[PDB]
Amino acid sequence: GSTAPPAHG
Amino acid sequence: EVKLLQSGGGLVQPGGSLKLSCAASGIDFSGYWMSWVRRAPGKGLEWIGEITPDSSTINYAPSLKDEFIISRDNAKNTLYLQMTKVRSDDTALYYCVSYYEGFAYWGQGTLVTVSAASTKGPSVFPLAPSSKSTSGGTAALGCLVKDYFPEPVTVSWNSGALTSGVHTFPAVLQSSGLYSLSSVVTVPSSSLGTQTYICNVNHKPSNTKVDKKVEPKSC
Amino acid sequence: QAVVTQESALTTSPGETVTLTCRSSTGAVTTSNYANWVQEKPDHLFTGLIGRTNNRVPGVPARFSGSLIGDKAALTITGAQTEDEAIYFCALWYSNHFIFGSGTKVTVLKRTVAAPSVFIFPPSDEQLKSGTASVVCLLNNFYPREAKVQWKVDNALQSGNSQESVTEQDSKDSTYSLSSTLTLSKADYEKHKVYACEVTHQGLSSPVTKSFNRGEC
């Protein structure tokens, strides 16, 4: 499903 | 209840190789970005690299992209960092971080000490002030614990009777691969001639014990 | 290679608001740089605060706010508290890597500022027998941590031969202590005469210098 948002996109 | 446990590290000789591990518990490790950062003595934070949840793309800092290799095993809930052919300035505290809108969850950090030195007892030199003439400007004495290896060293004053105002600083790894340390005490300048001050240095790794009396110069 | 720049140090009082900036050398800091802010408290206690310019990691109080102020990324601590006294690092995303800044030493005043007592220690004679000589400079019981010590050998500002060490903050009176050791070869030490240690601190209206001359007293 979803994964933890990182510090850069 | 999120915990990132680190293991590995320690003393490594120059040109060696080490592999650090970071075992995550309390999060769905498989769906978390991961990164390695390090804090060198006297330096700021330095970003080593980052790894996707599925290891699709791995990003290293351009400067040190050839020294380090980042990997992970989502099945084991573990993150690895292998440094190959280390150098003297790679000595630092290496931290294991997981992204969550930022550097959310950190590990305790493992220290890596790179040095080719063999265990050497310290040299204890007295830090004494020239003969004071000012009106009892509180005086300062101390010992200089120089050129020793490895880290653990204990300094006391007057066999432990003196503790008030004693400041024993953390050691600093010299450029020569050896450590160096300073212990200091402040005492009333009126008592410099009457009272004898002795610092007791103990380096257990070398079976060394030095009792050094600190007195001002003759002048 | 790009360089990230932040204020060397800042000082504020509990209740006030403080603003840290973070400047990119490549140009104006944009939202595409995804500014991150990390906090290091004493004893290497790192905690993340803000990422992606303005998103703060969940569970961080609202007084920490990330924004963009002109050409720089900004972290604003509104209504700061003593617990907020730490070193704040900035990270800027450059397409495929992060570059961390030097860090800003933010000070939140716990007590009245205290200026250090400065002492200078010449090298011992026994050490001179060894071929190297080290001059030690001690700053005793001062607050805040931010201090600058500079070595002057015959009015020549030295660099690259000094190493600093700082004690931990005393839980009782929150003061520090500093030892800067300047190491020289016995040759260079006996060549020159005047050795001086110049200390600059917030609790000092003018920087103080403590010196001594080789072979004199």
Short mmCIF file of C-alpha atoms in Angstrom, two decimals:
data_model
loop_
_atom_site.label_atom_id
_atom_site.label_comp_id
_atom_site.label_asym_id
_atom_site.label_seq_id
_atom_site.Cartn_x
_atom_site.Cartn_y
_atom_site.Cartn_z
CA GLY A 1 0.00 0.00 0.00
CA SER A 2 1.40 3.42 1.05
CA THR A 3 4.99 3.91 2.34
CA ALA A 4 6.29 6.60 4.78
CA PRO A 5 6.92 9.94 3.04
CA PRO A 6 10.63 10.74 2.56
CA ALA A 7 12.37 14.09 3.12
CA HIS A 8 12.71 14.80 -0.65
CA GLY A 9 10.49 14.30 -3.70
CA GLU B 1 7.70 2.24 20.74
CA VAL B 2 9.84 2.62 17.61
CA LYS B 3 13.44 1.49 18.10
CA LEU B 4 16.39 1.42 15.69
CA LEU B 5 19.13 -0.77 17.17
CA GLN B 6 22.63 -0.33 15.76
CA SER B 7 25.53 -2.77 16.01
CA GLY B 8 29.04 -3.04 14.66
CA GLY B 9 31.75 -0.46 14.46
CA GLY B 10 34.66 -0.12 16.83
CA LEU B 11 38.34 0.37 16.24
CA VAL B 12 39.46 -0.21 12.66
CA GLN B 13 42.90 0.28 11.22
CA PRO B 14 43.36 2.54 8.18
CA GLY B 15 42.63 0.80 4.90
CA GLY B 16 40.34 -1.66 6.68
CA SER B 17 36.67 -2.40 6.10
CA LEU B 18 33.63 -2.33 8.37
CA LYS B 19 29.93 -3.08 8.09
CA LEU B 20 27.32 -1.49 10.35
CA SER B 21 23.83 -2.88 10.89
CA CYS B 22 20.60 -1.20 11.99
CA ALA B 23 17.68 -3.41 13.04
CA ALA B 24 14.31 -1.63 13.08
CA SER B 25 11.45 -2.75 15.31
CA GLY B 26 8.08 -1.10 15.82
CA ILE B 27 7.50 0.13 12.24
CA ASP B 28 6.63 -1.43 8.90
CA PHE B 29 10.32 -1.20 7.94
CA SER B 30 9.49 -2.43 4.43
CA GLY B 31 7.64 0.79 3.66
CA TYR B 32 10.14 3.30 5.02
CA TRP B 33 12.90 5.27 3.38
CA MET B 34 16.27 4.85 5.10
CA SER B 35 19.43 6.94 5.29
CA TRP B 36 22.86 6.99 6.91
CA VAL B 37 24.42 10.12 8.43
CA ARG B 38 27.54 10.66 10.50
CA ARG B 39 28.80 13.27 12.97
CA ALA B 40 32.56 13.67 13.00
CA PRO B 41 34.43 15.18 15.96
CA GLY B 42 34.56 18.92 15.38
CA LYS B 43 32.50 18.64 12.19
CA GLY B 44 28.79 18.99 11.51
CA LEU B 45 26.36 16.39 10.29
CA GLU B 46 27.29 14.74 7.01
CA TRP B 47 24.81 12.93 4.77
CA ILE B 48 26.17 9.58 3.55
CA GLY B 49 23.28 8.16 1.56
CA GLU B 50 19.68 6.99 1.41
CA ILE B 51 17.89 3.89 0.16
CA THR B 52 14.36 3.36 -1.13
CA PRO B 53 11.96 0.95 0.60
CA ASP B 54 12.57 -1.49 -2.26
CA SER B 55 16.21 -0.51 -2.92
CA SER B 56 15.17 0.66 -6.40
CA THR B 57 17.40 3.76 -6.38
CA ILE B 58 20.23 4.32 -3.89
CA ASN B 59 21.64 7.84 -3.45
CA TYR B 60 25.07 8.56 -2.00
CA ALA B 61 26.71 11.90 -1.40
CA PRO B 62 28.90 12.60 -4.46
CA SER B 63 32.04 13.14 -2.37
CA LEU B 64 32.08 9.70 -0.71
CA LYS B 65 30.03 7.57 -3.12
CA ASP B 66 32.96 5.17 -3.66
CA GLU B 67 33.72 4.45 0.01
CA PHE B 68 30.29 3.32 1.22
CA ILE B 69 27.67 0.77 0.13
CA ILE B 70 24.12 0.98 1.50
CA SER B 71 21.88 -2.09 1.57
CA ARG B 72 18.81 -3.39 3.37
CA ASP B 73 16.93 -6.64 4.05
CA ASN B 74 13.23 -5.90 4.53
CA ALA B 75 12.72 -9.55 5.51
CA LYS B 76 15.10 -9.11 8.46
CA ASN B 77 13.98 -5.51 9.17
CA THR B 78 17.65 -4.52 8.97
CA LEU B 79 19.66 -1.78 7.26
CA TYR B 80 23.37 -2.18 6.51
CA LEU B 81 26.21 0.21 5.72
CA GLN B 82 29.58 -1.18 4.59
CA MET B 83 32.58 1.14 4.41
CA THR B 84 35.55 -0.29 2.49
CA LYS B 85 39.15 0.99 2.63
CA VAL B 86 38.54 3.58 5.35
CA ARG B 87 40.74 6.61 6.07
CA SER B 88 41.71 8.43 9.26
CA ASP B 89 38.99 11.08 8.90
CA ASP B 90 36.25 8.44 8.66
CA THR B 91 36.28 8.27 12.46
CA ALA B 92 32.86 9.56 13.50
CA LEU B 93 29.53 8.65 15.04
CA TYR B 94 27.44 6.94 12.35
CA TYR B 95 23.67 7.21 12.73
CA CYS B 96 20.82 5.24 11.14
CA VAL B 97 17.78 7.35 10.21
CA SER B 98 14.36 6.59 8.72
CA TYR B 99 12.44 9.24 6.75
CA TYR B 100 9.01 10.43 7.78
CA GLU B 101 8.59 13.93 6.38
CA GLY B 102 12.16 14.39 7.58
CA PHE B 103 14.76 12.63 9.68
CA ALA B 104 12.06 11.19 11.90
CA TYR B 105 13.46 8.16 13.74
CA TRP B 106 17.12 7.81 14.73
CA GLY B 107 19.35 5.07 16.06
CA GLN B 108 21.62 5.37 19.07
CA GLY B 109 24.63 5.67 16.76
CA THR B 110 27.77 3.52 16.67
CA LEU B 111 31.23 5.01 17.04
CA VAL B 112 33.89 4.07 14.48
CA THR B 113 37.50 4.85 15.41
CA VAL B 114 40.05 4.68 12.59
CA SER B 115 43.64 4.68 13.84
CA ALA B 116 46.78 2.66 13.12
CA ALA B 117 48.21 3.25 16.60
CA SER B 118 49.15 0.54 19.05
CA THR B 119 48.31 0.81 22.73
CA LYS B 120 50.66 3.41 24.22
CA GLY B 121 50.78 4.79 27.73
CA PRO B 122 50.33 8.54 28.10
CA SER B 123 52.82 11.23 29.03
CA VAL B 124 51.69 13.46 31.90
CA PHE B 125 53.06 17.01 31.80
CA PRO B 126 52.14 19.69 34.36
CA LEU B 127 50.13 22.74 33.32
CA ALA B 128 51.40 25.26 35.84
CA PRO B 129 50.97 29.05 35.82
CA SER B 130 53.93 31.36 36.06
CA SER B 131 54.38 32.88 39.52
CA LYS B 132 51.24 34.94 40.09
CA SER B 133 51.61 38.54 41.23
CA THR B 134 47.97 39.62 40.88
CA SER B 135 45.81 39.87 44.00
CA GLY B 136 44.87 36.22 44.45
CA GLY B 137 43.29 35.84 41.05
CA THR B 138 41.99 32.30 41.52
CA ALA B 139 44.70 30.11 40.12
CA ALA B 140 44.39 27.22 37.70
CA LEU B 141 46.53 24.09 37.57
CA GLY B 142 46.22 20.93 35.58
CA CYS B 143 47.82 17.96 33.90
CA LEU B 144 48.29 17.33 30.19
CA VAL B 145 47.72 13.68 29.31
CA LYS B 146 49.38 13.42 25.92
CA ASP B 147 50.00 10.75 23.29
CA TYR B 148 48.04 7.76 24.61
CA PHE B 149 45.90 5.02 23.05
CA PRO B 150 43.16 3.65 23.33
CA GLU B 151 40.55 5.96 24.79
CA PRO B 152 39.79 5.03 28.44
CA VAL B 153 41.84 7.21 30.82
CA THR B 154 41.00 8.41 34.34
CA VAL B 155 42.38 11.56 35.99
CA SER B 156 41.93 12.39 39.68
CA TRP B 157 43.47 14.99 41.98
CA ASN B 158 45.14 14.31 45.33
CA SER B 159 44.02 10.67 45.14
CA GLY B 160 40.38 11.77 44.93
CA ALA B 161 40.39 14.18 47.88
CA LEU B 162 40.20 17.14 45.48
CA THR B 163 36.98 17.35 43.47
CA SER B 164 35.77 20.96 43.88
CA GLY B 165 36.42 22.88 40.67
CA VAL B 166 38.12 20.03 38.79
CA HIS B 167 37.45 19.99 35.04
CA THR B 168 38.77 16.97 33.11
CA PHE B 169 38.06 17.58 29.44
CA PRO B 170 37.07 14.96 26.87
CA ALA B 171 40.01 13.64 24.90
CA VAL B 172 40.74 14.66 21.31
CA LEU B 173 42.17 12.30 18.71
CA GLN B 174 45.34 13.99 17.49
CA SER B 175 46.44 13.83 13.87
CA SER B 176 49.08 11.27 14.88
CA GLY B 177 46.43 8.66 15.74
CA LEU B 178 46.90 9.17 19.49
CA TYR B 179 44.63 10.87 22.01
CA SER B 180 45.34 13.89 24.20
CA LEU B 181 43.52 15.11 27.29
CA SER B 182 43.60 17.97 29.78
CA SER B 183 42.51 17.97 33.42
CA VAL B 184 42.22 21.30 35.21
CA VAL B 185 41.49 22.54 38.73
CA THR B 186 40.99 26.05 40.11
CA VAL B 187 42.32 26.89 43.58
CA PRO B 188 42.85 30.06 45.59
CA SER B 189 46.13 31.65 44.53
CA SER B 190 47.06 32.20 48.18
CA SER B 191 47.49 28.44 48.66
CA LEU B 192 49.80 27.71 45.71
CA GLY B 193 52.96 27.61 47.83
CA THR B 194 51.48 25.92 50.90
CA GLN B 195 49.31 23.19 49.34
CA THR B 196 50.65 20.35 47.19
CA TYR B 197 48.48 19.37 44.22
CA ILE B 198 48.91 15.97 42.56
CA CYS B 199 46.98 14.62 39.57
CA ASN B 200 46.62 10.84 39.29
CA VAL B 201 46.51 9.56 35.70
CA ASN B 202 45.46 5.95 35.08
CA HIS B 203 45.65 4.25 31.67
CA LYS B 204 44.44 0.71 32.27
CA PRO B 205 44.92 -0.42 28.63
CA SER B 206 48.67 0.15 29.09
CA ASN B 207 49.07 -0.69 32.80
CA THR B 208 50.28 2.87 33.36
CA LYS B 209 49.96 4.96 36.52
CA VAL B 210 51.43 8.46 36.84
CA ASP B 211 51.25 10.72 39.89
CA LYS B 212 52.47 14.18 38.87
CA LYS B 213 52.90 17.10 41.25
CA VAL B 214 51.93 20.46 39.74
CA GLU B 215 53.80 23.48 41.13
CA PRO B 216 54.49 26.92 39.64
CA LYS B 217 57.77 27.93 38.06
CA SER B 218 60.73 29.12 40.12
CA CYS B 219 61.19 32.46 38.32
CA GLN C 1 29.95 21.00 -5.19
CA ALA C 2 27.51 23.39 -3.51
CA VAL C 3 27.85 24.88 -0.03
CA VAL C 4 25.01 25.42 2.46
CA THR C 5 25.39 28.33 4.90
CA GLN C 6 23.71 29.09 8.23
CA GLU C 7 24.23 31.61 11.01
CA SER C 8 27.24 30.74 13.16
CA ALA C 9 25.22 31.09 16.37
CA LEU C 10 22.23 32.93 17.80
CA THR C 11 21.10 34.00 21.26
CA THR C 12 17.56 34.60 22.51
CA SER C 13 15.50 34.57 25.71
CA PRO C 14 12.66 32.25 26.77
CA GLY C 15 9.37 33.43 25.30
CA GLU C 16 10.94 35.27 22.37
CA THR C 17 10.98 34.12 18.73
CA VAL C 18 14.10 33.20 16.76
CA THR C 19 14.63 32.70 13.03
CA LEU C 20 17.39 30.58 11.53
CA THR C 21 18.22 30.96 7.84
CA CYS C 22 19.86 28.57 5.39
CA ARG C 23 21.43 29.82 2.15
CA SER C 24 22.34 27.78 -0.92
CA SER C 25 25.42 28.70 -2.94
CA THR C 26 23.85 27.60 -6.24
CA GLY C 27 21.28 30.39 -5.99
CA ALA C 28 18.00 31.13 -4.26
CA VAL C 29 16.66 28.33 -2.09
CA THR C 30 13.52 26.95 -3.74
CA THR C 31 10.85 24.55 -2.54
CA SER C 32 12.46 22.02 -4.90
CA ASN C 33 15.42 22.02 -2.47
CA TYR C 34 13.22 20.36 0.20
CA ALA C 35 14.86 22.07 3.16
CA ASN C 36 15.33 19.85 6.21
CA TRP C 37 16.06 20.94 9.78
CA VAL C 38 17.72 18.64 12.31
CA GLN C 39 18.40 19.43 15.97
CA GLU C 40 21.35 18.20 18.02
CA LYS C 41 21.03 18.70 21.77
CA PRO C 42 23.93 18.05 24.16
CA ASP C 43 25.45 14.55 24.23
CA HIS C 44 24.77 13.93 20.51
CA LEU C 45 20.98 13.89 20.87
CA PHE C 46 19.75 14.23 17.29
CA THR C 47 16.04 14.76 16.64
CA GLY C 48 14.44 15.63 13.32
CA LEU C 49 12.20 18.68 13.15
CA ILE C 50 11.17 19.74 9.62
CA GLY C 51 11.41 18.29 6.13
CA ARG C 52 10.34 19.28 2.63
CA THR C 53 10.62 22.98 3.50
CA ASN C 54 7.56 23.20 5.77
CA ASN C 55 6.41 19.70 6.72
CA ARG C 56 7.41 18.95 10.31
CA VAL C 57 7.95 15.39 11.46
CA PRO C 58 4.84 14.29 13.41
CA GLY C 59 5.03 14.81 17.15
CA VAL C 60 7.15 17.98 17.04
CA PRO C 61 5.59 21.02 18.76
CA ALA C 62 3.99 23.71 16.63
CA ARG C 63 6.42 26.44 17.72
CA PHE C 64 8.88 25.01 15.19
CA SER C 65 7.79 26.21 11.75
CA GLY C 66 9.58 25.86 8.41
CA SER C 67 9.21 28.42 5.64
CA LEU C 68 11.00 30.24 2.83
CA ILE C 69 12.24 33.76 3.53
CA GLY C 70 13.46 35.37 0.33
CA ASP C 71 16.42 33.45 -1.07
CA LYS C 72 16.90 31.24 2.01
CA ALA C 73 15.09 28.49 3.86
CA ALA C 74 14.00 29.48 7.34
CA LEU C 75 13.25 27.72 10.62
CA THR C 76 11.38 29.92 13.09
CA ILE C 77 11.14 28.99 16.77
CA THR C 78 8.28 31.17 18.03
CA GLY C 79 8.02 31.31 21.81
CA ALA C 80 11.31 29.52 22.37
CA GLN C 81 12.04 27.61 25.58
CA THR C 82 15.22 26.51 27.32
CA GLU C 83 14.71 22.98 26.01
CA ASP C 84 15.09 24.44 22.51
CA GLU C 85 18.74 25.39 23.13
CA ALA C 86 20.61 23.17 20.66
CA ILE C 87 22.53 23.10 17.38
CA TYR C 88 20.29 23.29 14.31
CA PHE C 89 21.49 21.73 11.06
CA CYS C 90 20.08 22.51 7.62
CA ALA C 91 19.90 20.15 4.64
CA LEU C 92 19.11 21.10 1.04
CA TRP C 93 18.11 18.54 -1.59
CA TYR C 94 20.18 18.90 -4.76
CA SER C 95 18.34 16.58 -7.17
CA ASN C 96 20.11 13.37 -6.08
CA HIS C 97 21.76 14.14 -2.73
CA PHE C 98 21.48 16.08 0.51
CA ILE C 99 24.08 18.64 1.60
CA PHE C 100 24.11 19.48 5.30
CA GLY C 101 25.00 22.92 6.62
CA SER C 102 27.64 23.88 9.17
CA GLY C 103 24.92 24.30 11.81
CA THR C 104 23.66 27.19 13.94
CA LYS C 105 24.32 27.14 17.69
CA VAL C 106 21.07 28.57 19.04
CA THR C 107 21.26 29.70 22.66
CA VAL C 108 18.18 30.18 24.85
CA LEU C 109 19.22 31.98 28.02
CA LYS C 110 18.81 29.77 31.08
CA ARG C 111 20.78 32.10 33.38
CA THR C 112 22.68 35.37 33.36
CA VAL C 113 25.50 35.32 30.84
CA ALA C 114 28.85 34.43 32.41
CA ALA C 115 32.19 35.40 30.93
CA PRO C 116 35.03 32.86 31.05
CA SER C 117 38.11 33.15 33.22
CA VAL C 118 41.04 32.75 30.81
CA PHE C 119 44.35 31.11 31.72
CA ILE C 120 47.41 30.35 29.60
CA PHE C 121 49.87 27.53 30.27
CA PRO C 122 53.36 27.44 28.74
CA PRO C 123 54.95 24.10 27.82
CA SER C 124 56.71 22.13 30.53
CA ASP C 125 60.47 21.63 30.42
CA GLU C 126 60.17 17.83 30.51
CA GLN C 127 57.95 17.97 27.42
CA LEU C 128 60.47 20.21 25.65
CA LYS C 129 63.01 17.42 26.14
CA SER C 130 60.70 15.38 23.88
CA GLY C 131 60.99 17.68 20.84
CA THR C 132 57.45 19.10 20.77
CA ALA C 133 55.86 21.83 22.87
CA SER C 134 52.17 22.47 23.54
CA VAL C 135 50.65 25.69 24.89
CA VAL C 136 47.28 25.22 26.62
CA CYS C 137 44.59 27.89 27.03
CA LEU C 138 41.77 27.36 29.53
CA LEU C 139 38.39 29.14 29.55
CA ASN C 140 36.68 28.37 32.86
CA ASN C 141 32.98 28.38 33.77
CA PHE C 142 31.28 30.41 31.06
CA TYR C 143 27.83 30.51 29.46
CA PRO C 144 26.71 30.26 26.67
CA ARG C 145 28.82 27.69 24.83
CA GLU C 146 29.64 29.91 21.84
CA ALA C 147 33.19 31.20 22.31
CA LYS C 148 36.09 31.94 19.99
CA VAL C 149 39.72 31.40 21.02
CA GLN C 150 42.57 32.53 18.77
CA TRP C 151 46.32 32.01 19.11
CA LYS C 152 48.87 34.75 18.38
CA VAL C 153 52.59 33.90 18.32
CA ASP C 154 54.48 37.20 17.99
CA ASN C 155 51.27 38.77 16.67
CA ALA C 156 50.96 35.98 14.07
CA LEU C 157 47.47 34.46 14.06
CA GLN C 158 47.97 30.69 14.10
CA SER C 159 45.74 28.18 12.34
CA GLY C 160 45.79 24.42 11.90
CA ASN C 161 47.82 23.65 15.04
CA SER C 162 45.12 24.17 17.69
CA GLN C 163 42.59 21.62 18.96
CA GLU C 164 39.63 22.49 21.19
CA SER C 165 37.78 20.40 23.77
CA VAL C 166 34.67 21.44 25.70
CA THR C 167 33.12 19.98 28.84
CA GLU C 168 29.48 19.06 29.19
CA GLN C 169 26.99 21.65 30.40
CA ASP C 170 26.72 21.58 34.19
CA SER C 171 23.15 20.76 35.17
CA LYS C 172 23.49 23.08 38.19
CA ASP C 173 24.70 26.42 36.79
CA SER C 174 24.70 25.52 33.06
CA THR C 175 28.31 26.66 32.60
CA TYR C 176 30.99 25.23 30.28
CA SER C 177 34.78 25.02 30.21
CA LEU C 178 37.15 25.12 27.25
CA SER C 179 40.70 23.88 26.65
CA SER C 180 42.46 24.91 23.43
CA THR C 181 45.83 23.22 22.94
CA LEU C 182 48.33 24.71 20.49
CA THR C 183 51.08 22.27 19.53
CA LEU C 184 54.40 23.30 18.00
CA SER C 185 57.77 21.77 17.30
CA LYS C 186 60.43 22.58 19.86
CA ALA C 187 62.22 24.39 17.03
CA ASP C 188 59.32 26.72 16.22
CA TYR C 189 58.51 27.31 19.89
CA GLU C 190 62.05 28.42 20.76
CA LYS C 191 62.20 30.59 17.63
CA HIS C 192 59.42 32.92 18.80
CA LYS C 193 58.90 34.73 22.09
CA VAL C 194 55.38 36.10 22.71
CA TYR C 195 52.55 33.57 23.02
CA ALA C 196 49.02 34.87 23.47
CA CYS C 197 45.48 33.50 23.73
CA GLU C 198 42.71 35.89 22.66
CA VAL C 199 39.19 34.97 23.83
CA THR C 200 35.96 36.50 22.48
CA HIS C 201 32.71 35.86 24.37
CA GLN C 202 29.22 37.33 24.62
CA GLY C 203 29.76 38.26 28.26
CA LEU C 204 32.79 40.35 27.28
CA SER C 205 32.52 43.92 26.00
CA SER C 206 35.98 43.59 24.43
CA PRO C 207 37.90 40.36 23.73
CA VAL C 208 40.45 39.59 26.46
CA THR C 209 43.98 38.35 25.78
CA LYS C 210 46.11 36.35 28.23
CA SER C 211 49.75 36.01 27.20
CA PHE C 212 53.24 35.05 28.37
CA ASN C 213 56.76 35.24 26.96
CA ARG C 214 59.08 32.27 26.50
CA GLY C 215 61.89 32.11 29.05
CA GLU C 216 60.46 34.99 31.11
CA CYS C 217 58.16 35.28 34.13
#
